Amino acid sequence: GTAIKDLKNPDRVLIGGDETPEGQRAVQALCAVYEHWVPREKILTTNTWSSELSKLAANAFLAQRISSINSISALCEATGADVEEVATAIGMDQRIGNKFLKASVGFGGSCFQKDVLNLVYLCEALNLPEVARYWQQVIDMNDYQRRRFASRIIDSLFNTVTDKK
Amino acid sequence: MFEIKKICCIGAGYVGGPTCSVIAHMCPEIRVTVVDVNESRINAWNSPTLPIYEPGLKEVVESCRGKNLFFSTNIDDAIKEADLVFISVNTPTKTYGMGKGRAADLKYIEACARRIVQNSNGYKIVTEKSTVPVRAAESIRRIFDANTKPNLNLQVLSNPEFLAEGTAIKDLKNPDRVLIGGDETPEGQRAVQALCAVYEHWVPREKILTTNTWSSELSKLAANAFLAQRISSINSISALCEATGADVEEVATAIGMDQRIGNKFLKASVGFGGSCFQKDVLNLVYLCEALNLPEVARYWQQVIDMNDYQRRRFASRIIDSLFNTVTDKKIAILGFAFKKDTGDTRESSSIYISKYLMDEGAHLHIYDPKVPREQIVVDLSHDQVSRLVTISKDPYEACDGAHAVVICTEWDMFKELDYERIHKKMLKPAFIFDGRRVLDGLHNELQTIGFQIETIGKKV
Amino acid sequence: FEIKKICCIGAGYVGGPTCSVIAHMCPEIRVTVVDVNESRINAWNSPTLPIYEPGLKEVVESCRGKNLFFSTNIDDAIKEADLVFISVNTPTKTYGMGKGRAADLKYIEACARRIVQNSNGYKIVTEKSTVPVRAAESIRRIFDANTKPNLNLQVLSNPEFLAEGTAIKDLKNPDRVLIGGDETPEGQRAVQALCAVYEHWVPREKILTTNTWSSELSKLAANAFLAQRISSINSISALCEATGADVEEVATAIGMDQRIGNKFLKASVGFGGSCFQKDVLNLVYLCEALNLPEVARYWQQVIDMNDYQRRRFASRIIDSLFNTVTDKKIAILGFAFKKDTGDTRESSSIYISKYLMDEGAHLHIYDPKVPREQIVVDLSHDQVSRLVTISKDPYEACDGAHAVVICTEWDMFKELDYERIHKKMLKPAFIFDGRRVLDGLHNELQTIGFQIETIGKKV
Ligand SMILES: [Cl-]
Ligand SMILES: [Cl-]
Ligand SMILES: [Cl-]
């Protein structure tokens, strides 16, 4: 949706490479390409696996923010609190920020669920079940949010929706 | 519109004390009176030596004490005179009964509510400053309504603190935001604007947020939970880093440069500590269970489990490295505080790491530059301490004949040690377990010296 | 306030017989029974009624034409009525949230919207069918949301308690009449108005007034308490077979305790019917939805025990036949859920047969009253074609069979020629008595050569 702007003025460019002489040369070659229009302060160099992992974790952190405020939204409906008020109050903490704190029926897109599910599987394959089920909560909460929303509609219509417009 | 001239605060803790001291300092026309049931605390605040240490606090207090800032044991009179009453008492986690070890105990808050109505007449604004469970203000409203009088109009507000213990004064003088919650009624709005007016003396109106009472209560709990979740998230990543060859400090950096995520609270560790994070998250979880929200409850519970996992994991790596036997082995523990530059050990990860090693029968030599000796012994009790715990006056006494050095607090001084010396008198193989990434950049040095060095979020 | 004109929506086995009786005891009241199905109505106006109940034909003929009417003109019948009975059946949901347990309120909702559209002034709206709790709140909400000037609709609960088979007798002399209404001035008036109607032939001592939610809940719990009694004695029956005790003896001893009573204590292969399981399951779901999991699993036990009883019985047959039943002829005697009816709804015979069909048995089924095609329908989802034969007489079913299974307490089964049956049965010949109908005949049957096993008796 904002591809061109994101490319022309990125928060950061991520490049991962082998921690070897040949590897460092290849990194600096690619680094040099981006230096044409990206300030060197905003170019980050890591080993290959940190770069791969950073892409997955970043999307997961984002998705977690949405699922977290969504969980709060459910607790708001039960207490009388208001999630937009709470989100605002949370978001004014500079350490937390005010982006990705808008509660919804649930997040979508071709990246968030796909990458978090991929992250979870990786942890299972690496015998990290505690970490796997930690991140799985992001998906379950999103599923919960949707199911919950649907169930409220159905209850409000007296648990019968047959042939109703 | 109603103006506040006299302020009473119940509780001289790390919350009410600095908050009211600052208010008095920025509002010379208002008489702020801080009271507490503990005569010890009161006499300490009026003493040349204060009961808690915060940068710039000593100056601020001395500027106001006597003019418009007073510390007294006379609670009833301070209530009698006050236009605004801050309830700033701690709500300890219940240690028994329904909700043991998770639910907040409202006993102290309930007492204050009954004490206020007993000693007050006319119009007064009653504001909860302490971290409370949601719908707590309903409990206060219920006590006031049940004990009403002719010409008694008590208004209940929520105004939670957000100061980090260590930078209190700066956080108060220049806060990211001030939160005030009130009833969505005419009388309620007046009370809100009265409190709002007090903060407008030195806080820009852009940074004052008004919500209903429950959003304010909930915001304090959720904010700390969001913070704690960040730490547990990067910690989970750290474990995945050790298994892949990735590096958590690199990953944290890459994540943190996303403006929508930010770079604060992304430093992996042996696990977070303090008197607020676990306490409030556990309180949040219990609330959800009580409200039949099991999906939400177990969602936030993951923040705590991951923190426990991180600690247990770290302890287990040490034990495995020492061939799953630690009996009668000397082990240096460097740093006992829950974070650097404090003597606070409340929920310190050092406690658990030490305790895990004690369950293996290790000879622990613990060093912390600031933490008092007696505090360590208390935090490691329920006999067990006498056999296994030795407390070193200096770091080197702890590494003399030790199998391993475990760093559990990110003290700046640990980075600057003579590790050439330490290695010479250590048993081989000699291990360093860095639980705070403080020796990042020193790895190649330590290895060529002869150390085996392991740290959070880096493959061995 | 007096009630003068009554409209009933639904000419089922509930609304039909109930309103015909009311007309017979209330000559001054004009009772109009309506249904959107033109088929049903003409049957009510026919010399042949759409349902059979003893003495119903008489009661109807007394009133039909004078103050009892069956019509398809629903809108006008609602317009004229002081009291509107909602008497449509509430089927269990077959999909979605609450599948196979929760009640579907669609027919009730339609009726509620139809009433408010076609009505003005003061009217009492009473639910007669077995409904889930808080259903009247749904009706109230439709009324409140679709209000008119000078519209005062009162919502009452008045559930049925008639056993299908002796409806009229149950109506003329009921154990109690139940009426639930709002605890408000207007609400109490509507209740006493309806209360007054039944006082025409029901003593005031046997008319109970409660709030609306107590009334709805009472109908479900009453059937559940009954079902629990059967499942309890059935559970005991299994414990009898394991101890040497006898369930008929124990049931008798228990039932002589005045505080317990001796009704509904007859052990069986399992209870059936269109009400017991449906209502208990509906009760369980209600508890789950209201975050009452302890109560939900408490009542679920009534269903599990009944399922256990059936499965247990089927397994005994299979074990006795050396755990192989493939291509073996087996006589099934009795298919109805109880004796003296053609009703097969939730009949234990269905499950027993199905368990035996999953073993590849050759079932020859006989039932004196139950129609042939109904059995074929109740045993489908191909499997029926290969394994199920329907016998015209019992002996056709026991000719070359390995075992005789009795699943319905028909009186005639007691009087069969077991000497003849045994000669043309394969050996060893088994009789499995699932209804204790052959109690007292055991020593007889054994000397003939039968191995006889029954519910609640050690072999
Ligand atoms: Cl006092
Ligand atoms: Cl030990
Ligand atoms: Cl019509």
From Swiss-Prot, chain B:
EC number: 1.1.1.22
Name of the featured protein: UDP-glucose 6-dehydrogenase
Organism: Homo sapiens (Human)
Residues that hold substrate according to the record: 161-165, 220-224, 260, 267-273, 338-339, 436
Active site: residue positions: 161, 220, 276
Activation and inhibition: UDP-alpha-D-xylose (UDX) acts as a feedback inhibitor. It binds at the same site as the substrate, but functions as allosteric inhibitor by triggering a conformation change that disrupts the active hexameric ring structure and gives rise to an inactive, horseshoe-shaped hexamer.
Similarity comment: family membership: Belongs to the UDP-glucose/GDP-mannose dehydrogenase family.
Effect of residue 217 to D: In DEE84; uncertain significance
Oligomeric and partner information: Homohexamer.
Effect ascribed to mutating residue 94 to E: Loss of hexamer formation. Causes formation of stable dimers. Strongly reduced affinity for NAD and UDP-glucose, and strongly decreased catalytic efficiency at pH 8.6
Pfam families: UDPG_MGDP_dh, UDPG_MGDP_dh_C, UDPG_MGDP_dh_N
Keywords: Acetylation, Allosteric enzyme, Carbohydrate metabolism, Disease variant, Epilepsy, NAD, Oxidoreductase, Phosphoprotein
Record PTM N6-acetyllysine, positions in chain: 107
Region (Allosteric switch region): 129-135
Enzyme class: oxidoreductase
Region spans: Disordered: 88-110
